[PDB]
Amino acid sequence: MKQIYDTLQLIPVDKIDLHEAFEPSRLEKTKESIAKEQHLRHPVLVVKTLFGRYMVIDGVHRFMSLKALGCEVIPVQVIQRTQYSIGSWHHKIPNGAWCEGLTDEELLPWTTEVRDETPFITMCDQQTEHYLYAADLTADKLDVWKKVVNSYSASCNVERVPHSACLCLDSNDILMKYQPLQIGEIEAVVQRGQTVPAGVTRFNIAGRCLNLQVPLHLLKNSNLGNQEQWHTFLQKKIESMRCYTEKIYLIEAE
Amino acid sequence: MKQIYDTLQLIPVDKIDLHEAFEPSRLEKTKESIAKEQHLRHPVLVVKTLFGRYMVIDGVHRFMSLKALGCEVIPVQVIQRTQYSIGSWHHKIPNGAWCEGLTDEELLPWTTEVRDETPFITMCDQQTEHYLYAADLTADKLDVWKKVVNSYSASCNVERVPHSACLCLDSNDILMKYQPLQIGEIEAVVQRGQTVPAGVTRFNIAGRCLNLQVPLHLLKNSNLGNQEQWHTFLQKKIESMRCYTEKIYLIEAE
Amino acid sequence: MKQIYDTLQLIPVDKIDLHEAFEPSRLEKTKESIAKEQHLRHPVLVVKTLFGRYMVIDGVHRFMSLKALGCEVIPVQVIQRTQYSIGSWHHKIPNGAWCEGLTDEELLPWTTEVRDETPFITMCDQQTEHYLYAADLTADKLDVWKKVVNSYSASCNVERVPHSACLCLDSNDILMKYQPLQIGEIEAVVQRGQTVPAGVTRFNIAGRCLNLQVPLHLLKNSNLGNQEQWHTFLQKKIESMRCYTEKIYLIEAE
Amino acid sequence: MKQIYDTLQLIPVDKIDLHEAFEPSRLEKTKESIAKEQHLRHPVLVVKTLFGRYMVIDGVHRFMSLKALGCEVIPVQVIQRTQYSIGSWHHKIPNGAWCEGLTDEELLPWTTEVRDETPFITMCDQQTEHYLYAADLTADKLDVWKKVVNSYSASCNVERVPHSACLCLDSNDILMKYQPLQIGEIEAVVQRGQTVPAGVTRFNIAGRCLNLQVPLHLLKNSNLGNQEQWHTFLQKKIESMRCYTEKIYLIEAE
Ligand SMILES: Nc1ncnc2c1ncn2[C@@H]1O[C@H](COP(=O)(O)OP(=O)(O)O)[C@@H](O)[C@H]1O
Ligand SMILES: Nc1ncnc2c1ncn2[C@@H]1O[C@H](COP(=O)(O)OP(=O)(O)O)[C@@H](O)[C@H]1O
Ligand SMILES: [Mg+2]
Ligand SMILES: [Mg+2]
Ligand SMILES: [Mg+2]
Ligand SMILES: [Mg+2]
Ligand SMILES: [Mg+2]
Ligand SMILES: [Mg+2]
Ligand SMILES: [Mg+2]
Ligand SMILES: [Mg+2]
Ligand SMILES: [Mg+2]
Ligand SMILES: [Mg+2]
């Protein structure tokens, strides 16, 4: 447990990259709550990446909220490569025929053929599968991916299901399956200045620190004096830290 | 997630049994903190037992603190049998030769013989094992167990280690091993009006609810009116509930 | 390891019990096969029972083949509790919607309420699960189990399905799910002179000895002695034993 | 399953590479055994390589026995990536404190600092772990690996130890720990015409075909053809194939 202290750091805001598109309603809600509370409940989870920088793997909305509220440093928890894995979320639309984004005039080259290579995107109903193969796309595969996801994401009662799960579709479900990305692929996206669609990458992260409740007043100055105050704050919080190994239901309110 | 609401209940204090001895310093600390905060951070974890009663499986000190502070009902989380298992803690004394409770005049019938039956208690050092066999004890096995545990528990820098763990002892460690109890054995202890020693039973519990922060003012009346207020409180808290599946480090302070 | 050698024993046929009804079609082919070969390829797997008897946990048809062939002694491997577990086979009726023996059961008290207590039997179709809870049974739990299984086993195509299988039922499927028995419960069936329905219990056994190839002649004339020959035989075979740990596909011919 | 049948193939000896140095004592006994029997009991397990070649992942000594015996063709089973994993064997030197080749290594830059990056090699005694980090190496990582292993393999008693083993070192033990290689890395060694030190790589392979017993005569005169005989042979053997899933002890004689 005595290593967590070392992973909780204040990082300059300009050193942090995002790889995932934000959700506008989620950002408004996160920003309003941070502004009201003037604390950050959970530190932003980051991994070290190229060029001395840090990449958010959990906390896009918290990060953007803190930035907009004028924070010059971000409370992060630095996650080591051995303590996370990357999977994907499948997206279950519980009544596809009432999902306007899916019943629209279709323009992409969906096909039912199974090929030797893995499909870029798979759309499933109870009886059939349609595929998009990377080899058939003209637009940047990233722009096609985002168009597909955003067509139904805010409007069709989507339920995210772990890509590894066992799921049986009823007679009107649609299931969207996406391929898991490796960390190197995500870094190439960031290097290009791009982001992946929201709610598709699924980081499984061991050892997250919760309920740190960092007061925003520690985050407004890029320089020091605040570092002694940060250490004092952290020492006090770590005194009350406890570890839980099984599944937990955390009440996130005061 | 929508089942947790049903498991969080206010139970009359007189319907709740303990099976484990409290630690006096731990009780003082828990009671002081509850009194200062006038909230219960985490609900007491209980299992249904015989006679319409409930048995604490986590929260002896919280329970006794609430009782002493005048609570007539206890916020519990009812844990189902399929969501916990019972193991044991081994107790590592990091310098046994400086542990007065272990270097005392010895009176129990320790033996190095390995027998066909399982030992009641095992004391290990780096090279040797000594056993206490239930078949050799005169005193109630429970009273012998408590004498052994309390001889070193508060004084010899004990480190609790999961009975299933891999541990290598250095040249001065002592390791005390205790047998896991089954739920039926624990219930027989309670039926006798007895308790097992502190810090030996190890419940592994899936799905615990944390940071509920129940205000003590909801707990002082055995009758109702408070039940509508309990439902309103619970509805608000459950709105902010989130599930975490991997290991977490929870900061337990405000 | 020499521990294995000691578990390979010749047991009087009269001391061996079955817990599972046999299939005569499988019995004829097993008997035929053993008769042609004059060797028992794989020893019967048994567990030690009360009264000094043994219970077959794998080898119902081998046992009765040898028994029917006049063997006074059975080559067994004695399995310890630590090296096996008891699961269950599900039963899929792919045309169950047309299975007469199943759709006319007006007498048994099936129900759809999910209770806190595990159900005795579960019957699933594409959109409904029905449950038999032990607390509602009108007659002996075993004879009810038997009646359910036989209502479709003899008049409807069936295939076993493992618990791990992710199976999505189509419009005419029925899936029967049975609760796994503990070892104590199976010992009860056998001591009432009975058996469980065939094809339901699933024993997961580690460390089976394969390809011992015991000549049948060792299994008769026990009244003259056979221990000398047996150990002479075992020592020669044991020397070529090799341990394999993952899933294997064994070619069983020469 | 018929998928297995298709993975059992006769491969020209010239298209098969080894990744591991052999032991001549084990080679003589393997050759002797195959020569006496005139059958290859278990097929060589290989993976498809670049350029259309194959790499042995189990069967270094069987391959070279057949090769030394003049076989122009090798009976292999082609293993897919999904059915194996690459681990490592630890090396225990029970009298390592007196192992001269190990206690005089003044040249290699061992270090005790634990860094965020996994180490290349780890050397353990009862109270100290020393590490070789790839970023400190003076020469080729493979030749350093080789030098370390050979410093004790030829002049000190050694026994392999599995990763899962809970091992407490005594006063004179030394334990060497090696980092598991990925498949890409082993392919590199072979394409540089080299091998890794013996007894370190640990392949966990699921679905091995056992007891095929391929007659040696099928493996010569390939210049006249052998596909007809091969399939005739496989169809007869495949019909007696049986799948076993847990640990088995196979008697390998008739
Ligand atoms: N008729 C048979 N022909 C060939 N092998 C058989 C036959 N019956 C049994 N066996 C061998 O015994 C093993 C298990 O047989 P099984 O059908 O379970 O009968 P039992 O009831 O004796 O276990 C099989 O893996 C097979 O190798
Ligand atoms: N000398 C031998 N005698 C008997 N069986 C052998 C011999 N060599 C190899 N085998 C068979 O091959 C299997 C693996 O042999 P192994 O020692 O790993 O050599 P290889 O390098 O060919 O894998 C063993 O399980 C054994 O059944
Ligand atoms: Mg998040
Ligand atoms: Mg639907
Ligand atoms: Mg559309
Ligand atoms: Mg506790
Ligand atoms: Mg010590
Ligand atoms: Mg004492
Ligand atoms: Mg069987
Ligand atoms: Mg069907
Ligand atoms: Mg080998
Ligand atoms: Mg030693």
Side-chain angles (χ1 to χ4, degrees), chain B residues 99-108 110 123 147-148 151-152:
Chain B
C99 177
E100 296 202 42
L102 288 178
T103 65
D104 262 326
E105 176 185 76
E106 188 57 54
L107 305 168
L108 298 162
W110 295 98
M123 174 190 290
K147 244 168 291 184
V148 170
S151 73
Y152 60 77

Side-chain angles (χ1 to χ4, degrees), chain A residues 20 45 57-62 160 208, chain B residues 242 244:
Chain A
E20 181 182 21
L45 305 181
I57 60 166
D58 193 7
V60 169
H61 299 94
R62 279 165 278 165
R160 297 192 311 180
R208 51 214 307 165
Chain B
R242 287 197 183 195
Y244 296 91

Side-chain angles (χ1 to χ4, degrees), chain B residues 142-161:
Chain B
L142 185 77
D143 299 322
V144 168
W145 191 11
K146 279 176 164 180
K147 244 168 291 184
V148 170
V149 167
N150 300 336
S151 73
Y152 60 77
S153 267
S155 42
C156 298
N157 299 295
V158 179
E159 173 183 350
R160 297 192 311 180
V161 312

Side-chain angles (χ1 to χ4, degrees), chain A residues 39-208:
Chain A
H39 295 74
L40 175 69
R41 181 171 298 274
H42 312 311
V44 173
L45 305 181
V46 302
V47 295
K48 297 188 179 178
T49 193
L50 313 170
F51 303 114
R53 303 181 60 77
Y54 300 82
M55 189 183 61
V56 173
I57 60 166
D58 193 7
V60 169
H61 299 94
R62 279 165 278 165
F63 170 83
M64 299 184 54
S65 297
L66 296 172
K67 184 169 177 263
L69 295 170
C71 297
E72 291 160 36
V73 298
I74 305 297
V76 305
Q77 186 182 357
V78 178
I79 302 299
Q80 300 286 105
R81 202 163 276 185
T82 59
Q83 76 183 115
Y84 75 93
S85 62
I86 308 179
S88 192
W89 294 105
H90 297 161
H91 291 170
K92 181 184 151 179
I93 298 109
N95 184 349
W98 286 55
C99 177
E100 296 202 42
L102 288 178
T103 65
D104 262 326
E105 176 185 76
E106 188 57 54
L107 305 168
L108 298 162
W110 295 98
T111 180
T112 50
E113 173 186 43
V114 173
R115 300 175 182 176
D116 283 314
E117 74 265 19
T118 306
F120 184 62
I121 301 166
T122 301
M123 174 190 290
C124 306
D125 70 15
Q126 178 181 260
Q127 307 270 64
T128 65
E129 295 184 357
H130 288 266
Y131 308 110
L132 284 190
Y133 290 99
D136 295 333
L137 304 177
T138 323
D140 194 309
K141 70 153 208 179
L142 185 77
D143 299 322
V144 168
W145 191 11
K146 279 176 164 180
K147 244 168 291 184
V148 170
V149 167
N150 300 336
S151 73
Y152 60 77
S153 267
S155 42
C156 298
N157 299 295
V158 179
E159 173 183 350
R160 297 192 311 180
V161 312
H163 85 267
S164 47
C166 170
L167 180 63
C168 298
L169 304 179
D170 64 23
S171 62
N172 63 16
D173 294 326
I174 295 290
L175 185 65
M176 304 300 294
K177 305 181 168 186
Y178 303 104
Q179 296 308 314
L181 300 179
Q182 307 191 38
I183 183 62
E185 296 169 302
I186 292 169
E187 287 178 330
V189 166
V190 172
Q191 180 146 32
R192 280 176 277 166
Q194 289 178 310
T195 56
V196 305
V200 298
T201 55
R202 184 170 64 93
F203 286 82
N204 262 82
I205 305 175
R208 51 214 307 165

Side-chain angles (χ1 to χ4, degrees), chain D residues 14-29:
Chain D
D14 52 79
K15 297 280 179 180
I16 301 179
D17 302 301
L18 305 181
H19 80 258
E20 198 173 13
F22 71 96
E23 166 64 358
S25 72
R26 289 177 51 177
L27 186 159
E28 281 316 275
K29 276 124 70 172

